[PDB]
Design a protein around this ligand. Structure first.
Ligand SMILES: [Mg+2]
Ligand SMILES: [Mg+2]
Ligand SMILES: [Zn+2]
Lengths: 246, 49, 81
RNA sequence: GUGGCCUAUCGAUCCUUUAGUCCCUCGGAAUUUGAGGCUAGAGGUGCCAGAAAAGUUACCACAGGGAUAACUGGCUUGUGG
RNA sequence: UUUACUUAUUCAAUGAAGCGGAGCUGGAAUUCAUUUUCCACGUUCUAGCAUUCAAGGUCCCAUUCGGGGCUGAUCCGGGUU
RNA sequence: GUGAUUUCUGCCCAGUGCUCUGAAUGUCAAAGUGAAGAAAUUCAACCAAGCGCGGGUAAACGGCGGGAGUACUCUCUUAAGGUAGCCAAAUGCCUCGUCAUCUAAUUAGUGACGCGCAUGAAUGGAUUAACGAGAUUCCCACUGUCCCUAUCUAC
RNA sequence: CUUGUGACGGCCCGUGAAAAUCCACAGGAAGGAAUAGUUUUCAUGCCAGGUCGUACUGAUAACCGCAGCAGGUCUCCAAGG
RNA sequence: GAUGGGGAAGCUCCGUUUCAAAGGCCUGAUUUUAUGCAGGCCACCAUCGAAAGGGAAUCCGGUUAAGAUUCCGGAACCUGG
RNA sequence: UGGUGAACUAUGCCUGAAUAGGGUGAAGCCAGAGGAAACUCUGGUGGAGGCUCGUAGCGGUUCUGACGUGCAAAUCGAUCGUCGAAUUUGGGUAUAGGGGCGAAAGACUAAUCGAACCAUCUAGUAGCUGGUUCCUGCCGAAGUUUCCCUCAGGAUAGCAG
RNA sequence: UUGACCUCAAAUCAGGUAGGAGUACCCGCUGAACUUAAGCAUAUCAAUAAGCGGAGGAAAAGAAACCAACCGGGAUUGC
């Protein structure tokens, strides 16, 4: 048999992400001294479109506290942020949309976004368009906060992790039908080479586990063990249940 | 062996979530069935008497 | 049309001249000579290519310094006049 | 009288194991375990003078064969007419 | 089996900049004798601006063209976090 | 995996897979423990995961039967017995199925019928405007395809 | 008609390169005049600008298809009815 | 695609700013003077990669058997000093 | 076993380039009319679409035409599909052989692909096919027995010198 | 303040050295399969071919942690 397509994807020859027209990694400002002892005020200069990303970005300018210069950070724009808005980042920042408060200093029921997992990785959770994280509870002794993720999971992270208050702009995108293979082409043309997709059941048996036969059919069960090896994991990996529930 | 797994993946969980997950898995039904069998064994003795 | 019409599309060299051997075996994109090995330090040779070793071995050129070593040895590496 | 009234009713090498001799050897010399030998059986090859063994190929390949099929021709004429 | 500890090992960030402890100065605090503690400990109407070892205060120099120290900007441990 | 829209996607977790935070001596390696021995060693206990036991899962692979009474009911068997739809269909052996229509005449076409060798529901079922160098049947126009051939030009 | 350009409008779950290089602004370091300077982003005046390529075909005969092969091979200009 | 590093028995592989003590920049000061010592500034961090991308500056007339925005005549422009 | 190829072609990236004339007439907007109001109607404007007829271009349906020791190891002629985009294409660049790439044909990877090419191991093995080079003299067969994964082959006995 | 020590650096510091070629023979690493077994998997081919590292006129080995069991021999190498 041959090496199958998902097995070939990990070499990264033609499967790397197309990153020519992207404007930089959208990270939070680094947690130096001002953000953990007070706050700092920056300005939204422009809200721009990011190639291959459903959400817009915001170019926020701060002043460097140690040197006479300007720092320009790329935030993921929250819905409601406008150009010329003052953005406040820090422990003592007031609770408004766009501010970059740590999670220990927000009450119950707060909706945040671009949430750090550990304090300092500059944004990991709820970064796609329309997604958000809800603070479910606090725990001052052994200082942690429980959060509800966009997947519905409940995480318990540190209370020193930061998050931008509000929801990510650009929500409701996937409600519009694409209607066209050309539209899907232009969508994935700036992300990576993953479309179009051929059904492995329509291949030859040298090319896929599902290939072959005088009728297009899978053969054995399509639920694959987690302990399976590379070249075997083609189908529903480690499925607890299948089928459409009612 | 069970204990290691519970600590490994289910430490950050709440009872409400646990019950929901267990039901979806169907683990809960099995526990119930075993209990029912035990009741049945006692019942059989009673019927004989 | 994989034959005669496809042979008309051939006008871009894959290999150019090499600096150590002058062979036209220097791959343009790989930046490596396929015969001698340049830019590598060692020279490409293989024991299965014994005839190629015979083609490029010592004595197939001028031996601009090595022609005189036996004669200087026979005279005993003398100095003076 | 050296099994079944007679003509059928069954099995090599290697390996393991048993019985006998309690005999021979473990090679610097001894004792005791252990191991290896000798003689006679057993564990089995039914493809039965005894390889350890699933398919597919209409994508196919090679060496050959008229020792061998799928036409015509030839012998035959059951069957057919 | 649970549970400390950190120096081995592991992960992450930064142009290794504000770590830890103590002390001021305010507020709450009830003190049962004098302070037990706990929070703070220069910035939020506005698409401006913020840099020249910092101005001021103070002490020297050898005045002049200026120069240096302390404070402004609390101490202590050199564990970057 | 299936393949726009519309309309639906029935029953079955016994098998094969996949999956559990269940319950816990059945299987049970090396290391380690104990006993016997002079030791090599032998024998036991203990014994992780996975198997084994117990659940879930079919838009997972798949599967969707017989005998009586009068479509319906009862009984056997099974995990459950083909539901809604559709059909001599590109899927029907028998088969050139039977009836109607189309023709002078039709193993072709179309519309019906259905004990369907061997239809059937994301193995997707049924329907469907527009589109097609896709496959098939009929009609009008048209003609050397033909009755039945003849003639002319260039090379 | 060809082409350049301007102000617009439509489209996107597509909003459609980077660096060298050059200029300006903020800032006020420093240098500075009166018998004299300060300015060469104003005008004129002086000197130098190295190396390699440079012919021709670009196709029913200059390229590739064994060849003077009806094949293949990127592009600019484009009169009248 | 080197270096610092880390793999690999090794030919070599990874990585391109990384767990590196990674350098040069202008003013000058001195006028035994060479360029150290007065200073002060800055932290990218090799290099290769387009004869269609970016990019300092040239046009007309004439001239040869065969060259020309390149020669000749005239008229310009840019860069460095 | 060790090397060489993405000059053809497959795919992604980077940077460039090319594409007559028509037909239909989408939103938005303007005027008129009607209505009690919701809003409807009529006439314009506008110029949308992986729309359509059709050049250049890209492709290759049929004649199963020509040719078929050809112009040609895939061409020529007519008829065709498509023609503003999932378009066509230059150059640069990346992926290398049990590997790549594949809108999936086991297709393409230099006229080579159900595992490229080059050299070596290698004079690989063959119970199978073909061949096996002067004269004369004398003698002169077998296709049968037994065993063998034996049935196109051997061993053994027989026949012969 | 000054002078040592240790450790780590920088110099177009003073002087040197390594790389590559050849490779018949030599010292190592790595390492097949064709083939034979009348099939084939252990085996064989073969501790070979290919690949990699390193020398010399030779290299390597070499003066016993040896061979022996005898009345004992006496570095290594080769026939
Ligand atoms: Mg793709
Ligand atoms: Mg299949
Ligand atoms: Zn070379």
């Amino acid at each position: 048999g041959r090496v199958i397509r998902n097995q070939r994807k990990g070499a990264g020859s033609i499967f790397t992400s197309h990153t020519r027209l992207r404007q930089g990694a959208a990270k939070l400002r680094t947690l130096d001294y001002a953000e953990r002892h007070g706050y700092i005020r920056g300005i939204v200069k422009q809200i721009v479109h990011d190639s291959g990303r459903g959400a817009p970005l915001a170019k926020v300018v701060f002043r460097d506290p140690y040197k006479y210069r300007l720092r320009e950070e790329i935030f993921i724009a929250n819905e409601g942020v406008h150009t010329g808005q003052f953005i406040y980042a820090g422990k003592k920042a007031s609770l408004n949309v766009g501010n970059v408060l740590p999670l220990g200093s927000v009450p119950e029921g707060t909706i945040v976004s671009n949430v750090e997992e550990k304090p300092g990785d500059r944004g990991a959770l709820a970064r796609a368009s329309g997604n958000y994280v809800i603070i479910i509870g606090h725990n001052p002794d052994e200082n942690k906060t429980r959060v509800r993720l966009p997947s519905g999971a409940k995480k318990v992270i540190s209370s020193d992790a930061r998050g931008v208050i509000g929801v990510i702009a650009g929500g409701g995108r996937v409600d519009k039908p694409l209607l066209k293979a050309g539209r899907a082409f232009h969508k994935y043309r700036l992300k990576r080479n993953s479309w179009p997709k051929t059904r492995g059941v329509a291949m030859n048996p040298v090319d896929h586990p599902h290939g072959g036969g005088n009728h297009q059919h899978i053969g054995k069960a399509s639920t694959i063990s987690r302990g399976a090896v590379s070249g075997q994991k083609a189908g529903l990996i480690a499925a607890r249940r299948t089928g459409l529930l009612r | 062996g069970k204990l290691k797994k519970i600590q490994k993946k289910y430490a950050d969980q709440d009872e409400t979530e646990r019950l929901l997950r267990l039901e979806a898995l169907g683990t809960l039904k099995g526990i119930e069935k075993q209990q029912q069998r035990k009741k049945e064994e006692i019942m059989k003795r009673e019927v004989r008497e | 049309g994989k034959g005669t019409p496809s042979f008309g599309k051939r006008h871009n060299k894959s290999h150019t001249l090499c600096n150590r051997c002058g062979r036209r075996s220097f791959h343009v994109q790989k930046k490596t000579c396929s015969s001698c090995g340049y830019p590598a330090a060692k020279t490409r040779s293989y024991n299965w290519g014994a005839k190629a070793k015979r083609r490029h071995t010592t004595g197939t050129g001028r031996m601009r310094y090595l022609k005189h070593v036996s004669r200087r040895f026979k005279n005993g590496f003398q100095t003076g006049s």
